[PDB]
């Protein structure tokens, strides 16, 4: 996030980091319960990737991190690789996350919910702070 | 580097899909929602992460970081997967597995 700011550690407890086999963060995701993460289809997640929960300071060695294996990847069949429409994938964890003060789930909306233009929302992540 | 040591956050407004198309044109589909163009921008490495808004006092997943400015311009809206258009699939997938 460009021109964002540091979050309080643990204050976005559903935010996970998706790491490849080397440990390289390549995408974010959101815990929606103890067994499931929602992320973008264009991230191309596989069962060799790992869900990292409870991480907020990659400069810390004292965090209660959970490295969670992925049992199965559920890419939305309607995902369009060219337009990037329907850009959603579900990850089922082989072992459930252990919820804690720093690890818990985001709420999901109803399909009929109206989040109007001008509503102030929040995005979080480990992306670049400057291009 | 421009990689943050610590998780980042930013507040940003939702855009109407008509106003988002003023930037991105026909690339904006019904299953997308735009936000930002307000001084912050999602950028490389934020993909797949959450865009949350309050509903009944609780943070609710409204978007998933999808794509945005080629240079992460903060005067250009970011594009997010519109979860209201995709949550029926999410809930069905959870129920079937």
């Amino acid at each position: 996030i460009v021109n964002g700011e540091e979050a309080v550690p643990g204050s976005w407890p559903w935010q996970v980091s998706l790491q490849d086999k080397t440990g390289f963060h390549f995408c974010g995701g959101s815990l929606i319960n103890e067994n499931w993460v929602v992320t973008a289809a264009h991230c191309g997640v596989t069962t060799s990737d790992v869900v990292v929960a409870g991480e907020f300071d990659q400069g810390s060695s004292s965090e209660k991190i959970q490295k969670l294996k992925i049992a199965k990847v559920f890419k939305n069949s309607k995902y369009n690789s060219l337009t990037i429409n329907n850009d959603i994938t579900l990850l089922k964890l082989s072992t459930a996350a252990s919820f804690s003060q720093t690890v818990s789930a985001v709420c999901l909306p109803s399909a009929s919910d109206d989040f109007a233009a001008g509503t102030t929302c929040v995005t979080t992540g480990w992306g670049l702070t400057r291009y | 580097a421009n990689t943050p040591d610590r998780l980042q956050q930013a507040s940003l407004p939702l855009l109407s899909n008509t106003n988002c198309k003023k930037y991105w044109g026909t690339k904006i589909k019904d299953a997308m929602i735009c936000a930002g163009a307000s001084g912050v921008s999602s950028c490389m490495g934020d993909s797949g992460g959450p865009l949350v808004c309050k509903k009944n006092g609780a943070w609710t997943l409204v978007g998933i970081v999808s794509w945005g400015s080629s240079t992460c311009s903060t005067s250009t809206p970011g594009v997010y997967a519109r979860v209201t258009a995709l949550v029926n699939w999410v809930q069905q997938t959870l129920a079937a597995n």
């Binding site: 643990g10 789930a105 985001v106 | -």
Partner: peptide, 13 residues
């Protein structure tokens, strides 16, 4: 869901 035990603090300067 959606209510962190550690409340986020959004701020600026």
């Amino acid at each position: 869901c959606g209510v962190p035990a550690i409340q986020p603090v959004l701020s600026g300067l």
